[PDB]
Write a protein that holds these residues in place. Sequence first.
Motif, PDB file in Angstrom:
ATOM      1  N   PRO A   1       0.801  -1.231   0.000  1.00 47.86           N
ATOM      2  CA  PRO A   1       0.000   0.000   0.000  1.00 47.86           C
ATOM      3  C   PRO A   1       0.827   1.271   0.000  1.00 47.86           C
ATOM      4  O   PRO A   1       1.956   1.270   0.498  1.00 47.86           O
ATOM      5  CB  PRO A   1      -0.810  -0.087   1.294  1.00 47.86           C
ATOM      6  CG  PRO A   1      -0.190  -1.145   2.109  1.00 47.86           C
ATOM      7  CD  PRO A   1       0.654  -2.012   1.243  1.00 47.86           C
ATOM      8  N   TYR A   2       0.264   2.342  -0.563  1.00 50.20           N
ATOM      9  CA  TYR A   2       0.829   3.689  -0.426  1.00 50.20           C
ATOM     10  C   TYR A   2      -0.078   4.543   0.437  1.00 50.20           C
ATOM     11  O   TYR A   2      -1.286   4.572   0.219  1.00 50.20           O
ATOM     12  CB  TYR A   2       0.916   4.366  -1.804  1.00 50.20           C
ATOM     13  CG  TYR A   2       1.322   5.825  -1.763  1.00 50.20           C
ATOM     14  CD1 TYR A   2       2.537   6.215  -1.203  1.00 50.20           C
ATOM     15  CD2 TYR A   2       0.504   6.816  -2.312  1.00 50.20           C
ATOM     16  CE1 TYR A   2       2.920   7.556  -1.163  1.00 50.20           C
ATOM     17  CE2 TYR A   2       0.889   8.164  -2.296  1.00 50.20           C
ATOM     18  CZ  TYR A   2       2.100   8.521  -1.723  1.00 50.20           C
ATOM     19  OH  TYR A   2       2.518   9.849  -1.717  1.00 50.20           O
ATOM     20  N   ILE A   3       0.498   5.235   1.418  1.00 52.33           N
ATOM     21  CA  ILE A   3      -0.281   6.118   2.285  1.00 52.33           C
ATOM     22  C   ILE A   3       0.447   7.444   2.431  1.00 52.33           C
ATOM     23  O   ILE A   3       1.664   7.461   2.595  1.00 52.33           O
ATOM     24  CB  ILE A   3      -0.464   5.495   3.689  1.00 52.33           C
ATOM     25  CG1 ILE A   3      -1.195   4.156   3.584  1.00 52.33           C
ATOM     26  CG2 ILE A   3      -1.251   6.452   4.614  1.00 52.33           C
ATOM     27  CD1 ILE A   3      -1.120   3.311   4.851  1.00 52.33           C
ATOM     28  N   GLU A   4      -0.289   8.555   2.372  1.00 58.86           N
ATOM     29  CA  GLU A   4       0.328   9.862   2.639  1.00 58.86           C
ATOM     30  C   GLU A   4       0.123  10.303   4.082  1.00 58.86           C
ATOM     31  O   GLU A   4      -0.912  10.012   4.694  1.00 58.86           O
ATOM     32  CB  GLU A   4      -0.205  10.928   1.679  1.00 58.86           C
ATOM     33  CG  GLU A   4       0.312  10.694   0.260  1.00 58.86           C
ATOM     34  CD  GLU A   4       0.165  11.887  -0.667  1.00 58.86           C
ATOM     35  OE1 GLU A   4      -0.530  12.873  -0.303  1.00 58.86           O
ATOM     36  OE2 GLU A   4       0.765  11.819  -1.761  1.00 58.86           O
ATOM     37  N   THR A   5       1.112  11.018   4.609  1.00 60.56           N
ATOM     38  CA  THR A   5       1.092  11.446   6.008  1.00 60.56           C
ATOM     39  C   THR A   5       1.583  12.885   6.164  1.00 60.56           C
ATOM     40  O   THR A   5       2.291  13.419   5.303  1.00 60.56           O
ATOM     41  CB  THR A   5       2.046  10.572   6.873  1.00 60.56           C
ATOM     42  OG1 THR A   5       3.379  10.700   6.370  1.00 60.56           O
ATOM     43  CG2 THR A   5       1.645   9.088   6.856  1.00 60.56           C
ATOM     44  N   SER A   6       1.217  13.496   7.285  1.00 60.68           N
ATOM     45  CA  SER A   6       1.878  14.706   7.757  1.00 60.68           C
ATOM     46  C   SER A   6       2.178  14.559   9.239  1.00 60.68           C
ATOM     47  O   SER A   6       1.256  14.453  10.046  1.00 60.68           O
ATOM     48  CB  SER A   6       1.007  15.948   7.555  1.00 60.68           C
ATOM     49  OG  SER A   6       1.608  17.067   8.202  1.00 60.68           O
ATOM     50  N   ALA A   7       3.465  14.525   9.593  1.00 60.98           N
ATOM     51  CA  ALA A   7       3.853  14.531  10.995  1.00 60.98           C
ATOM     52  C   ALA A   7       3.434  15.838  11.655  1.00 60.98           C
ATOM     53  O   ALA A   7       3.267  15.887  12.881  1.00 60.98           O
ATOM     54  CB  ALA A   7       5.361  14.327  11.148  1.00 60.98           C
ATOM     55  N   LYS A   8       3.281  16.893  10.856  1.00 60.61           N
ATOM     56  CA  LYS A   8       2.915  18.196  11.412  1.00 60.61           C
ATOM     57  C   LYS A   8       1.445  18.268  11.842  1.00 60.61           C
ATOM     58  O   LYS A   8       1.144  18.711  12.948  1.00 60.61           O
ATOM     59  CB  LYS A   8       3.256  19.317  10.434  1.00 60.61           C
ATOM     60  CG  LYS A   8       2.927  20.720  10.972  1.00 60.61           C
ATOM     61  CD  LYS A   8       3.455  21.789  10.036  1.00 60.61           C
ATOM     62  CE  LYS A   8       2.964  23.171  10.461  1.00 60.61           C
ATOM     63  NZ  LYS A   8       3.251  24.189   9.410  1.00 60.61           N
TER      64      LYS A   8
END
Length: 166
Positions: free
Chosen positions: A140-147
Amino acid sequence: MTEYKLVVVGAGGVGKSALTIQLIQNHFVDEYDPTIEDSYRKQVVIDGETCLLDILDTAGQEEYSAMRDQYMRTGEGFLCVFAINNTKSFEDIHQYREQIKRVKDSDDVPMVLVGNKCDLAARTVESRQAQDLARSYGIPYIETSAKTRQGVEDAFYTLVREIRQH
Ligand SMILES: Nc1nc2c(ncn2[C@@H]2O[C@H](COP(=O)(O)OP(=O)(O)NP(=O)(O)O)[C@@H](O)[C@H]2O)c(=O)[nH]1
Ligand SMILES: [Ca+2]
Ligand SMILES: [Ca+2]
Ligand SMILES: [Mg+2]
Ligand SMILES: [Mg+2]
């Protein structure tokens, strides 16, 4: 109890540490302190199972990557992280995956592809490009923001769910 050994890899500065720290400590690290090798442990419930996550946060800098190999060998699943505003980090992913296959001596290793910094607008990696790479790997591909915390739990829990399929 049931313990999952996760390893976070990827180029320098993509947000490996910020992601892990958001997951574990619930705050965003704004400064950039390059990592040598750090580990974190936390008890969490994932899909009704009480378990222990043991997370290895690795160096992205060549100069700090001393002996990452031996530490990574015990990993059960790998988060392969690039940043959506850093084309070079995306191009480096194939090399990180090859390293993982070398240290596990297998071409069947649980992994998830993660495009971090999705809060930023200077995007040079389009979602479809990364989807295509993940598809070629069967992951799978997943997008994230640690911010903003968008997708952070989703990324790590998806990796646990991948380990459970192997
Ligand atoms: N806007 C934004 N900045 C982020 C995000 N994740 C990390 N950063 C920023 O990017 C910088 C590097 O983050 P860091 O987590 O240290 O990266 P790293 O991949 O662990 N680096 P290293 O490989 O050297 O240990 C920091 O200034 C951090 O605040 C994100 O999702 N959004
Ligand atoms: Ca902060
Ligand atoms: Ca090997
Ligand atoms: Mg780091
Ligand atoms: Mg383009």
